[PDB]
Amino acid sequence: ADVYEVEDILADRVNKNGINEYYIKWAGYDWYDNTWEPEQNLFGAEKVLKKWKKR
Amino acid sequence: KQTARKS
Ligand SMILES: [Zn+2]
Ligand SMILES: [Zn+2]
Ligand SMILES: [Zn+2]
Ligand SMILES: [Zn+2]
């Protein structure tokens, strides 16, 4: 439903709850649509997340 | 194909 394709992860931060959030480039959406998402929202994006974490 | 929930 509110689920979209991830093009890439661009940055990360820890919020106030100590949860990692990731700055997402959404495939097919322009850079003004980028959003910070908590780690759980990346359930469908295992490969790009692990690449981001290892780099 | 990578998917995620967008707030
Ligand atoms: Zn479903
Ligand atoms: Zn747009
Ligand atoms: Zn827009
Ligand atoms: Zn990092």
From chain B, pick out residues whose CB is under 8 angstroms from the CB of A4.
3-4, 6
Beta strands at A3-14 and A20-26: parallel, antiparallel or unpaired: antiparallel
CATH of the domain at A17: 2.40.50.40
Residue B3 gets which letter from DSSP? E
Interface of B with A (CB under 8 A): 1-7
Amino acid, res. A55: R
CB contact under 8 A, A3 and B2: no
d(CA A37, CA A26): 11
Query: How far apart, in whole angstroms, are the C-alpha atoms of residue A19 and residue A39?
Result: 7
CA-CA-CA-CA dihedral for A3, A33, A22, B3, to nearest 10? 20
Amino acid at A14: V
Resolution in A: 2.2
Q: Is B4 helix (H, G, I), strand (E, B) or coil?
A: strand
Question: Read out DSSP for chain A?
Answer: --EEEEEEEEEEEE-TTS-EEEEEEETTS-GGG-EEEEGGGGTB-HHHHHHHHH-
Residue pairs spanning A and B at CB distance below 8 A: 43
For residue A17, the enclosing domain spans: 1-55
Count the domains in chain A: 1
Closest CA to B5 of A12, A17, A50, A21: A21
